[PDB]
């Protein structure tokens, strides 16, 4: 029981007061993209970054004259040396096109 | 309580809670190799028996 043209005067007062968009005609202004908050930085941190390892453990205490073997890497090298022993190593990397 | 889960923790932002299972592997590796530190044969003047 109140004119619509009269209610807009109140709706417009709130917009001027609270600083909101006054769009009585429902025009597509793309403002829904402006209100949507970014989500890039939340997704970029998904995979943990490379951090301290045994190499940084050896370099930290290496100044004091302390050593420690890398059972993972020392085993990898031991395996490669075994292959080359029985003629099973990798071929020579080719650096040119096949021709 | 510390004997039910390896990480006794609660946080309101779970970003500090999802990587713990992976870190446990990395931390345990550091501790294992940390306690295996040994002097270099040249520091103690020990003659290394290479083999």
């Amino acid at each position: 029981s109140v004119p619509r043209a009269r209610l807009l005067q109140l709706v417009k007062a709130r917009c001027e007061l609270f600083s909101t968009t006054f769009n009585p005609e429902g025009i597509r202004t793309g403002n829904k993209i402006l209100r949507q908050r970014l989500k890039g930085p939340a997704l970029a941190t998904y995979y943990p970054r490379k951090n301290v390892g045994i190499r940084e453990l050896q370099k930290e205490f290496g100044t004091l004259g302390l050593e420690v073997d890398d059972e993972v890497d020392d085993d990898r090298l031991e395996h490669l040396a075994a292959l080359r022993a029985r003629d099973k190593g990798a071929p020579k990397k080719k650096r040119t096109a096949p021709s | 309580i510390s004997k039910e889960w390896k990480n006794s923790i609660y946080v309101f932002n779970h970003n500090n809670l999802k990587n713990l299972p992976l870190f446990d592997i990395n931390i345990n590796s550091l501790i294992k190799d940390y306690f295996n530190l040994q002097f270099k044969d040249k520091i103690l003047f020990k003659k290394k028996r290479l083999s």
């Binding site: - | 040249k42 003047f45 003659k47 290394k48």
Partner: peptide, 14 residues
């Protein structure tokens, strides 16, 4: 470089 060889030069003189 290449196939690694053992670092035989490791000793401390008295």
């Amino acid at each position: 470089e290449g196939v690694p060889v053992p670092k035989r030069e490791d000793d401390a003189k008295l």
